[PDB]
C-alpha cells in the first residue's frame, strides 16, 4: 500500500531539507577580495550547537580579539561596530528592519540569519560572503559570528591559534547555530522537538519496519543521546565538493529510555513506530525539548 507518513517524515530527510554538514557545516564557498573561503550553508537551524574553545578565558559568543590577538584570544562573535550590529536583540532587529516588509516580520531565527547575512566583509561590493549567526533563544539576542570555522583540534597544534570543536554542551541548550541559508519556513520543514513514544522506522510493504542495522552507544538520558548523534552526524570537515557531506551521515538516533541505548543510523527514516520506551532524535533537533504525543497520521 501507499505510505501515509510521507508528508510528516519530510522534515526527517536531512539530506534534502538541510543539505549540508551538521557537526561542521561548510557546504558552500564564497569570495572576499579575490580569495575563496568555505562557509556554512545548511537550510535548517541547528538547535543546541555551540563552539568549545580549548583552554579559554571566555566563551565563543565573546567578540573576536583584535589585531595580532585575533584567533589567539577572545571568541568568535562580531567585534563592536559603529553603529552596533552585533549582538542585536529581537526587538532591535525588528526596529532596524522596519522599512523592509520582507525582513521585519520574519520569525526570530530567520531574522537573525538575514541580519548576519547583511554584513559585507571589508565592504567588498563584489563579495557573496555571508557570516553565520548564533541565536540565543532564552535572552532573544542575535550574535553575528565573525569566525565561520567550527573545528580546529588536530593533535598537531592541539601565543598561537586557539583550538576548538563544535558541541552540544549543556550551556548551549538555548543556542541555535544558523547558516546564511536558514529557510523562512524552518518550523514546517525542519526538525526541532524530539518525538516521545516514537521510534523511527522504514516503511516496507504497508508496514513500518525497525531500522535493520543500528550502532548502539550507551547514554544516560536524551540529552547525551542527542550529543552522540550530533558528534557522529554529517560533517564537512575530516575529524581530528572536496569534503562536502551534502547532509549524508549518522544524523538520526532512536533513544531507548529503559536500556539507556542511543541507536544511531545513517539512512533517512520513512515512518514512525509507536513505542513507549523510545524517543526519536536527530543531530539538528533540540537536545531537551520533546513533543509529548505520538502523531495521528490520516
Amino acid at each position: 500500500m501507499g505510505n501515509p507518513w510521507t508528508e510528516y517524515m519530510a522534515k526527517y530527510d536531512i539530506e534534502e531539507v538541510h543539505g549540508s554538514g551538521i557537526r561542521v557545516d561548510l557546504g558552500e564557498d564564497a569570495e572576499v577580495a579575490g580569495t575563496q573561503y568555505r562557509l556554512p550553508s545548511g537550510k535548517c537551524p541547528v538547535f543546541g550547537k555551540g563552539i568549545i574553545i580549548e583552554n579559554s578565558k571566555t566563551t565563543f559568543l565573546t567578540p573576536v580579539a583584535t589585531g595580532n590577538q585575533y584567533l589567539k584570544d577572545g571568541g568568535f562573535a562580531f567585534p563592536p561596530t559603529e553603529p552596533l550590529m552585533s549582538p542585536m536583540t529581537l526587538d532591535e532587529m525588528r526596529h532596524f528592519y522596519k522599512d523592509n516588509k520582507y525582513v521585519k516580520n520574519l520569525d526570530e531565527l530567520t531574522l537573525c540569519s538575514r541580519h548576519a547575512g547583511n554584513m559585507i566583509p571589508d565592504n567588498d561590493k563584489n563579495s557573496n560572503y555571508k557570516y553565520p549567526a548564533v541565536y540565543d533563544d532564552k535572552d532573544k539576542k542575535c550574535h553575528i559570528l565573525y569566525i565561520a570555522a567550527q573545528e580546529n583540534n588536530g593533535p598537531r597544534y592541539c601565543n598561537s591559534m586557539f583550538c576548538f570543536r563544535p558541541a552540544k554542551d549543556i550551556s548551549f541548550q538555548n543556542y541555535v547555530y544558523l547558516s546564511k541559508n536558514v529557510v523562512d519556513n524552518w518550523e514546517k520543514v525542519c526538525p526541532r522537538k524530539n518525538l516521545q513514544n516514537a521510534k523511527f522506522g522504514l516503511w516496507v510493504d504497508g508496514n513500518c519496519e525497525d531500522i535493520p542495522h543500528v550502532n548502539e552507544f550507551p547514554a544516560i538520558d536524551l540529552f547525551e543521546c542527542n550529543k552522540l548523534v550530533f558528534e557522529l552526524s554529517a560533517s564537512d570537515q575530516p575529524k581530528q565538493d572536496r569534503y562536502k557531506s551534502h547532509g549524508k551521515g549518522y544524523n538520526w538516533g532512536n533513544y531507548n529510555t529503559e536500556t539507556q541505548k542511543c541507536e544511531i543510523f545513517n539512512v533517512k527514516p520513512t515512518c514512525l513506530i509507536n513505542d513507549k520506551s523510545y524517543i526519536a532524535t536527530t543531530a539538528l533537533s533540540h537536545p531537551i525539548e520533546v513533543e509529548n504525543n505520538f502523531p495521528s497520521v490520516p
Binding site: 580569495t35 575563496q36 568555505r38 554584513m119 571589508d122
Partner: peptide, 18 residues
C-alpha cells in the same frame, strides 16, 4: 585560491538597501 580563516577586516558594508 582558498584560505582557511577570514582576515579580521577594519570596515564593513551593508546589503540591507538591496
Amino acid at each position: 585560491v582558498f584560505a582557511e580563516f577570514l582576515p579580521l577586516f577594519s570596515k564593513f558594508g551593508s546589503r540591507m538597501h538591496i
